[PDB]
Design a protein around this ligand. Structure first.
Ligand code: FAD
Ligand code: FAD
Ligand code: RGS
Ligand code: RGS
Lengths: 461, 461
């Protein structure tokens, strides 16, 4: 039984960040990883995603070429070119991560970990046992797929994982889901030339975003050539002579349900949710609490119900983002190895960027949420809508929408919501301001940067 | 003698903003304007500049086309196309501004104003007299040109004004100056295909920026194809059979001076400074104080030395930016018409973006300035340099450099300096944070947005 100061199960965003910081603090740590370092973000997430988005972005900017004085650019996108390059880039990161572990003196135990029956918390990986007085579960999640029992042929469609394995651009594609992944994927497939549909169960996407964003986002999708099938759901999938045929039920409220076949589908992509990867851990041998989705339950300090067993990131099922796993794994190393008992992540005011076209940035409360927290009489919002100066000379147009939610008399800024060109890079510092508790006077007393999009947030009236 | 509550001399950024706010407060105001509303920014500045930069930006992104999966884009930029469109856009703004005045009930007195000999401060425009108990001088500045007496043939070159009148793309161009305008113009001419030189009297551009920025900026210029002639200056200009021929002295220190002829120059562009437009105001009839450059002297509240005569913006010669004229003209309307005696602009922490390639964002103190204000032992800086993920798959590369200057133990952030893709839109909110007095813990406690460039500012170590 080899013993360590800290054993980390999962070599992804959270596990790596935690192990690394712990090691700086003097801990003798090991990372168990059964697949590739970097975990979801690097391999099939954030990274290969952003590369594909920058690719889609080139496709749209190239539509503006002629408007800008140049001669029309003519053609066909070549998927394999960028795919090979994207893959290589991911290979490059994997080796950097591996080296990071090494320089830190972190041991890497390769293989699939599971808890044992043993009294003191202990895992087994490939017949060997390992133990530590602090064990971190950071095994993340996976794409959820439907059961053939509820939707026959569900297994003919792919997930975001499968999207990263594609070798050619699908001629016809149908995406099911209304979350950010769904949105992002529909936007990349479309810009790249796939004839794309987004199948959503209601009337808008991103329904948990401020309603200014779900509305604006649904429109921009449509304007960009994406067909959003509202109130629709898949009833069955079948392999036809040439692709797939998707049977769907459309149930607009106040209308009779209607069934439609969607034929000649090259790509059916499920973007319906994520499930926690806890199934094969043998948790129950220690009685670790999970919820009914298989999520590990933790407290504000990332503790599980069992002493010296913690969990961070996706597995815990809250705020499914890479920087949140990182921040939580980092605060936890300080708490365990630097004895900072108050060290924990504040889950409020986490900012998100959705890589749509135009991208989306959001931090803090939606208008509704502020209304529920402070009361209608104590919530005031400010907003603006304009056409970015980039489009002053184009025929193609996009819009920029910004919304600021304030609370109480002081007009404390509790929420910033926007969509528009540049909004991916504009977010970070307002998110700092929002964390510090700024009010609207603070924003207003900041001299504007002209001409930009970002100056609109500081000149709202 | 028509009387008003507020007479504004100048219909540019500062004069318009001041007149408008004053009118909301109940004042009966008139704007005197001898040219076009919008003043320098709209007509020959910020606006036509940004349009041309977005144009240059298309030129560079089009170099990356093939790397991204697409087929090479082949060609020739057409200057007249974009120029016509740019002009129309400016026409569009002029009419909006005019309408803004109108809806506000601001009277527009068209023509050139000058003070009179009269005891109570009074101006004359086209034989008629006008007066008010509060008069705002906001007549801005103009491009400085050399005297034929010091540099013979100086008059064969043009200024930034003339740049906006050009109808074709100059085949060979030489820019003189090392300030932001100079930089911006060299970057636009170059990207658009002009064979461009930047003639600077020292070894770096933007010498008043943090030294990380002047160095990085000089390099990026070179890497982008701009020839920076260091320690050089123009000795004479002459009209040859085919263009201009520029005689220059190059005086590298520790070396003998060397004289060079630069032949076949299509465009010689002076970007050497700006002079205040006060010459034709008859100031001296009221004894209004100016400095020896013709700048109007004011105090922290924008007062001149004469009661009920104020000055804002470029004419005053400090912080030559559109949003500063605006903020000062606005604070002044509140002070005069809303009786807020403490209403004035804080000139610290004004942020700037330089529209270079990649753009530059800066707010607060340079490393040197913090060193002088707090002492070497109390200044700590943090910085990073990396290749933005956009270039992971290109052959062409640019870099991103960020620097954070902190002071005292608390590590108060007194300065942020960066250069890189996205840096034009990233600045605004950090500038809010810097205005609020944030420290580095504040930045550090903000959850990062991944994958972006902006997340680097919040993960500095
Ligand atoms: C398509 C897509 C795009 C995304 N885009 C972004 C984005 O742009 N920005 C962002 O912030 N987030 C994004 N996310 C979310 C982000 O990827 C996740 O929040 C993040 O990866 C969660 O990290 P984690 O540390 O919990 O686990 P993961 O990163 O999933 O790592 C868990 C690791 O555990 C290993 N493992 C699991 N079980 C075991 C076991 N029993 N033994 C050993 N090893 C094991 C797995 O192989 C894996 O490497 C995206 C996600 C997806 C799917
Ligand atoms: C090439 C260039 C690019 C620039 N880019 C930017 C940028 O991107 N961002 C930025 O923030 N700043 C930029 N600037 C700076 C910005 O344009 C100036 O700071 C700003 O215009 C100053 O405004 P102002 O109100 O003092 O005067 P101005 O805007 O110059 O207006 C003064 C007005 O007074 C009128 N006038 C003058 N004398 C009289 C008189 N006697 N009677 C009647 N009318 C009179 C003039 O016609 C004019 O319209 C740029 C400047 C230039 C030259
Ligand atoms: N800052 C933005 C665009 C800002 N403005 C617009 O698109 C104007 C079209 S023209 S209004 C002047 C626009 N600016 C210029 O060209 C101005 C300039 O040269 O300063 C503008 O509103 N600029 C920003 C001023 C700032 N928001 C303030 O209040 O200080 N319409 C709206 O804001 C919607 C509305 O309120 O009707 C950008 O650079 O893309
Ligand atoms: N955030 C930037 C790029 C960031 N990183 C780099 O270019 C890495 C090349 S790889 S290091 C991992 C780079 N990221 C990923 O691909 C990571 C991911 O998938 O999270 C990275 O450093 N990401 C940001 C993590 C963050 N800055 C933190 O400290 O939390 N080199 C440096 O930062 C320079 C150095 O310190 O040697 C972007 O998205 O362009």
């Amino acid at each position: 039984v080899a013993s360590y100061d800290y054993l980390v199960i999962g070599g992804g965003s959270g596990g790596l960040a935690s192990a690394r910081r712990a090691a700086e603090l003097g801990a003798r740590a090991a990372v168990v990883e059964s697949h590739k370092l970097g975990g979801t973000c690097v391999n099939v997430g954030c990274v290969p995603k952003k590369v594909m988005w920058n690719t889609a972005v080139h496709s749209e900017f190239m539509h503006d070429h002629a408007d800008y004085g140049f001669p029309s650019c003519e053609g066909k996108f070549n998927w394999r070119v960028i795919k090979e390059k994207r893959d290589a880039y991911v290979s490059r990161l994997n080796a950097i991560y591996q080296n990071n572990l090494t320089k830190s003196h972190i041991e890497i135990i390769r293989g699939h970990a599971a808890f044992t029956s043993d009294p003191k918390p202990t895992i087994e990986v490939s017949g060997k046992k390992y133990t530590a007085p602090h064990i971190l579960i950071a095994t993340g999640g996976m794409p959820s797929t439907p059961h053939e029992s509820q939707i026959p042929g569900a297994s003919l469609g792919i997930t975001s994982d499968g999207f990263f394995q594609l070798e050619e651009l699908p001629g016809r594609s149908v995406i099911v889901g209304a979350g950010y992944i769904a949105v992002e994927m529909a936007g990349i497939l479309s810009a790249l030339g796939s004839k794309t549909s987004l199948m959503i169960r209601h009337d808008k996407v991103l329904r948990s975003f401020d309603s200014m964003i779900s509305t604006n986002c649904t429109e921009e999708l449509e304007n960009a050539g994406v067909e959003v099938l509202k109130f629709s759901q898949v009833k069955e999938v079948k392999k036809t002579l040439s692709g797939l045929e998707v049977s769907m039920v459309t149930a607009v409220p106040g209308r009779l349900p209607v069934m439609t076949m969607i034929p000649d589908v090259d790509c059916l992509l499920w973007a319906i949710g994520r499930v926690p990867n806890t199934k094969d851990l043998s948790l129950n041998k220690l009685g670790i609490q999970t919820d009914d989705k298989g999520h590990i339950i933790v407290d504000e300090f990332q503790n599980t119900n069992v002493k010296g067993i913690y969990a961070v990131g996706d597995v815990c099922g809250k705020a499914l983002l890479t920087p949140v796993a990182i921040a939580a794994g980092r605060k936890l190393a300080h708490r365990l190895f630097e004895y900072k008992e108050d060290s924990k992540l504040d889950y409020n005011n986490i900012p998100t960027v959705v890589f749509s076209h135009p991208p989306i940035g959001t931090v803090g409360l939606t208008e509704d949420e502020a209304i529920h927290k402070y009361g209608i009489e104590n919530v005031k919002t400010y907003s603006t809508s304009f056409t970015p100066m980039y489009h002053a000379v184009t025929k193609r147009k996009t819009k920029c929408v910004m919304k600021m939610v304030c609370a109480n008399k002081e007009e404390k800024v509790v929420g910033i919501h926007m969509q528009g060109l540049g909004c991916d890079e504009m977010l970070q510092g307002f998110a700092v301001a929002v964390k510090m508790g700024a009010t609207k006077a603070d924003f207003d007393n900041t001299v504007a940067i002209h001409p930009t999009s970002s100056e609109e947030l500081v000149t709202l009236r």
